[PDB]
């Protein structure tokens, strides 16, 4: 068991936020009589919302407003990446601890409840903890000190996650899939 402590990222790592957003974006396009495929919309949103709108909905009246309403509805039932809860469990079964660092406010906590993974986290750091944003290592150094982390892995989907982890003296994993993370961990 290579690491004891796991410092997670939510969006793009545990939470498939682009899936719920894609569902909302595709359904909003349909209101205007427009069909676009899942994979194109998903990739466009991963670039940015302005890119997705300029690409697929540049002159659709009230599109953003309606899209955001549909997205909020989708997020009544957020979607984790496939296999997340089983991986969290396998790690916890070996005595591992899970932490979460987010730049978002305390809505994070609602998402963890709705997806039934709140029980996994020893501590969830949100913006209300007052720390600087990644890639600044402040929040991960706080966790390292408070929880006396000697064997920690920082998992996130973006460069800033890796940079924060490195600057905090922790090993990192650039998340692409749950299966691949399992392969790296032998678990
Ligand atoms: Ca992320």
Query: Rounded distance, CA 182 to CA 187, Å?
Result: 5
Give the CATH fold of the 1-15+80-187 domain: Rossmann fold (3.40.50)
What's the 33 CA to ligand 1 centre distance in angstroms? 32
Question: Cα-flanking dihedrals φ and ψ of residue 162, to 5°?
Answer: -65, -45
What does CATH list as the number for 16-79? 1.10.150.240
In this structure, what token pair is assigned to residue 104?
């978002």
| Distance of alpha carbon 6 from alpha carbon 154, whole angstroms | 6
Ligand 1 centroid–CA 128 distance in Å is 18
The helix/strand count (H/E) of the chain reads as 9, 5
What is d(CA 169, CA 10) in angstroms, rounded to the nearest whole number? 21
What spacing in Å lies between the alpha carbon of 173 and ligand 1's midpoint? Answer: 12
Tell me, in angstroms, the distance from the centre of ligand 1 to residue 21's CA. Answer: 14
Quote the ligand 1 centre to 69 CA distance (angstroms): 22
Distance 102 CA to ligand 1 centre (A): 8
Experimental method: X-ray
Q: How far is the CA of 61 from the centre of ligand 1 (A)?
A: 30
* CA of residue 11 to ligand 1 center, whole Å: 4
**CB-CB contact of 160 with 185 (8 Å):** no
Ligand 1 centroid – CA 151 distance (Å)? 22
Among 179, 169, 173, residue whose Cα is nearest residue 161: 173
CA 33 distance to own-chain centroid: 31
Residue position matching structure tokens 């932490």: 99
Q: How far is the CA of 111 from the centre of ligand 1 (A)?
A: 14
CA torsion through residues 135, 139, 98, 75, sign: negative
Domain ranges of the chain: 1-15+80-187, 16-79
Give the resolution in Å: 1.4
As to burial, measured by CB atoms within 10 angstroms (0-12 exposed, 13-18 middle, 19+ buried), residue 68 is: middle
């Amino acid at each position: 068991m290579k690491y004891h402590d796991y410092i997670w990222d939510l969006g793009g790592t545990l939470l498939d936020n682009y899936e719920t957003s894609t569902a909302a974006f595709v359904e909003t396009l349909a209101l205007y009589g427009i069909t676009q495929d899942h994979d194109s919309v998903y990739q466009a949103l991963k670039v940015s919302t302005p890119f997705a709108i300029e690409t697929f909905a540049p002159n659709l009246e009230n599109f953003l407003e309606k899209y955001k309403e549909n997205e909020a509805r989708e997020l009544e039932h957020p979607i984790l990446f496939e296999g997340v809860s089983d991986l969290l469990e396998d790690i916890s079964n070996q005595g591992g601890r899970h932490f979460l660092v987010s730049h978002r406010n305390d809505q994070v906590l609602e998402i963890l409840e709705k997806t039934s993974i709140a029980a996994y986290f020893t501590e969830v750091v949100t913006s209300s903890s007052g720390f600087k944003r990644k890639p600044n290592p402040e929040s991960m150094l706080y966790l390292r000190e408070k929880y006396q982390i000697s064997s920690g892995l920082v998992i996130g989907d973006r460069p800033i996650d890796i940079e924060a982890g490195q600057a905090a003296g922790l090993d990192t994993h650039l998340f692409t899939s749950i299966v691949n993370l399992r392969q790296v961990l032998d678990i």
